[PDB]
Design a protein around this ligand. Structure first.
Ligand SMILES: [Cl-]
Ligand code: NA
Lengths: 139, 139
């Protein structure tokens, strides 16, 4: 069982950020993982946001990250057979990018993973999560 | 939409608690919801922690809740058809019970929901979450 691979291959993760008063917030995301092949460098998790400025929403995860960059993401596998349960969690620091190489990198990885991005537009900011630790569990 | 029923029927949710340094901690749980048949009263979400065996992960989670009762739980539904995505979130205040009526109430609801508890033991503390707000989204 490779935790990083199991996480990377999954379609959806839950992203947790901190609200202004410190309480946790949760939203699901689609995402792509970059495993740096210079081995010994931290993994990167990329996720795009469908948010326009001044006249729209989905603003909360961005506003949370801007105030406090500490985040966690979890991929879970449920089964009716509880001996088949597992999960993988990434804890890390999120940076929001509105231009540059990170946006390019994020867009690239996201399109490669999700074919839905052939029809669904991809013109919002990209969150880059530097993973400080991976955790996992199997039943 | 009906968000509460959708949440209540789902097999698994992601529970977010706060670590000692205030950063989010995430773990998936099985859970059961009590919706009061009286108007005004908040819903309660119940989830059990095993005490057949003590584990570092479970002591961490219990300590987080003891330290700060603020939690969030999310049920999400992924589909490769992104027009069918949805999620439901409960924000609330968690109390851990090691005996008493909350444990009885939680055990009863959990056994009613999960047939797996016919084989899996249920003799640990029960986390009872008083829901302060529900949120939901549909694609
Ligand atoms: Cl929201
Ligand atoms: Na909300």
């Amino acid at each position: 069982f490779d935790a990083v691979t199991a996480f990377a291959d999954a379609p959806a993760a839950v992203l947790s950020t901190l609200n202004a008063d410190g309480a946790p917030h949760l939203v699901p995301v689609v995402f792509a993982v970059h495993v740096p092949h210079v081995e010994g460098q931290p993994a990167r998790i990329y996720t795009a946001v469908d948010a326009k400025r001044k006249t729209t929403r989905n603003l909360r995860r961005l506003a949370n990250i801007d105030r406090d960059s500490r985040v966690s993401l979890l991929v879970d596998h449920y089964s009716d057979d509880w001996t088949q349960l597992w999960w993988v969690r990434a804890d890390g620091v999120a940076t929001t990018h509105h231009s540059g190489d990170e946006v390019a990198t994020g867009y690239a990885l996201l399109r490669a993973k999700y074919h839905q991005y052939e029809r669904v537009s991809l013109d919002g900011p990209v969150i880059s999560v530097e993973v400080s630790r991976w955790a996992s569990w199997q039943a």
